[PDB]
Amino acid sequence: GLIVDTRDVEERVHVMRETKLAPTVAHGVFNPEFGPAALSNKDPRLNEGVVLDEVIFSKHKGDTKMSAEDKALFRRCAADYASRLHSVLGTANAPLSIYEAIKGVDGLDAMEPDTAPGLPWALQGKRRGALIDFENGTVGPEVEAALKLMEKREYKFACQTFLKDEIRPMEKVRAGKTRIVDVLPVEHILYTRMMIGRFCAQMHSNNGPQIGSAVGCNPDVDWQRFGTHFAQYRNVWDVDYSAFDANHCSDAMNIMFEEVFRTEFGFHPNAEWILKTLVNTEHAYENKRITVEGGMPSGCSATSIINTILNNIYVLYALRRHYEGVELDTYTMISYGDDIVVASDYDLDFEALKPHFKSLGQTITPADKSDKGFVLGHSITDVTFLKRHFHMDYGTGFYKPVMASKTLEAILSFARRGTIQEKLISVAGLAVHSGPDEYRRLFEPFQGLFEIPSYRSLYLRWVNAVCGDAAALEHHHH
């Protein structure tokens, strides 16, 4: 994004906090090169010269204005992807009711009752529950008023910069690279869900290579589906971006919103409008108000879907900008936000695509260090996706999502107080695919103090999850 204005105002929107994460018993055993992100400039771990807001907004180094020709190409790619998307999902894209937007529907989680309400409510000491009845799925007069402004396209708002309390590599922690959540007003999230939540629900339910989206997938179940699909192709590329969300140019965002969320695909006219309010945004950090043109705000509602859609269009765009005769069946891919796996039988020169991604303001690099850039010949078993490898389970012959042990060690080394038992059961679901020896080793520090699921129990759970028929078939003989 391009920072076009910065000004100081009277109202100080607080951003500095103390971490809720503490080391666990596993920290002393694994000693990970990971720690809680700095949530304050006074944090002693920070390097000299580090000012949080400067580092946080340093990713905004311009809004790439695409040529007329490139925008035309982009719109064709956006429309072609949209065509695939709405062919698979259908056109049942009318607004959710206020009740449905709050309470959720099949394939769309309910709204969080006690997360940050955003501005100006945070400054007024009003929590989300003061504005919305999450039990009954109704809204108070303030939100009702705001919804009318959105209906009339007169609604304006500021985003609240919220520091992400999370574990990061210590290199990034000390550099002040604390990630953020751009907290939009609760009514904006509500209306966005009203406008495109039905579409988002359908995206989740139809996740896969066909629509190029893994959003709403269950890695336990879907690694078999994804792994088997990508194993059929000669080439598989693990592509990485740098600041994917920040570098979405306004042209790309606008054109995507225009082609994907058209009224002819069942959307209300304000679906495009409310999405377009994400393009030029004002961000509150303490007394500073920073206006950014371009880039996707780091939200938690429709952000992953939007980023996933753009990722799909980018690949089509880049390939078509370099090669002639490129269509959606020239390659295959799946994406979750910035994360992406691409495959094709064609020897696609991904190194040569670099400048074409650059015309979108995006910088692509291979997942591995840089073996003289991108290369052909890699398979599904070489790549990572959602921090998970595609490994073959010897017991079943199904693909399983295997996380690196150092990742799991880092995850296990920290936790929010009072949540550890819950976290361990969750992480056990991730760790089971590493095998019984590694599973045992990872949870050994917690044995006795907490209930650790048996490897056996999680393996059997997984077998049925990935293939119920296989689980059944194993009981045919004594």
Binding-site residue total for Mn ion (CB under 5 A)? Answer: 3
Closest approach of Mn ion to the CB of residue 240, in Å: 5
Query: Which of 73, 342, 367, 458: binder of Mn ion (CB under 5 A)?
Result: 367
338 is catalytic: yes
Closest approach of Mn ion to the CB of residue 230, in Å: 13
Using CB under 5 A as the binding rule, the residues of this chain from 76 to 95 that contact Mn ion are: none
Check binding of 182 to Mn ion (CB under 5 A): no
What's the gap between Cα 131 and its chain centre? 27
Find the residue with minimal CB distance to Mn ion: 367
Closest approach of Mn ion to the CB of residue 385, in Å: 7
Taking the least distance from each CB to Mn ion, the nearer of 109 and 240 is 240
Taking the least distance from each CB to Mn ion, the nearer of 365 and 464 is 365
Cα–Cα distance between 138 and 98 in angstroms, integer?
7
Closest approach of Mn ion to the CB of residue 224, in Å: 20
Query: Which of 109, 240, 282, 286: binder of Mn ion (CB under 5 A)?
Result: 240
Residue span binding Mn ion (CB under 5 A) among the ranges 42-50, 99-107, 236-244, 414-422: 236-244
Check binding of 238 to Mn ion (CB under 5 A): yes
Taking the least distance from each CB to Mn ion, the nearer of 123 and 243 is 243
Measured at the CA of 269, the angle between CA 106 and CA 203, to 5 degrees, comes to 30
Closest approach of Mn ion to the CB of residue 141, in Å: 47
Closest approach of Mn ion to the CB of residue 366, in Å: 9
Taking the least distance from each CB to Mn ion, the nearer of 367 and 430 is 367
Taking the least distance from each CB to Mn ion, the nearer of 367 and 427 is 367
Closest approach of Mn ion to the CB of residue 244, in Å: 11
Residue span binding Mn ion (CB under 5 A) among the ranges 58-66, 105-113, 283-291, 363-371: 363-371
Give the closest residue to 45 by CA, choosing from 128, 208, 168. 168
Question: Which of these is catalytic: 53, 338, 339, 393?
Answer: 338
Residue span binding Mn ion (CB under 5 A) among the ranges 224-232, 365-373, 414-422, 467-475: 365-373
Taking the least distance from each CB to Mn ion, the nearer of 240 and 438 is 240
Taking the least distance from each CB to Mn ion, the nearer of 220 and 238 is 238
Check binding of 133 to Mn ion (CB under 5 A): no
The residues annotated as belonging to the active site are: 338
Residues in the site for Mn ion, rule: CB under 5 A?
238, 240, 367
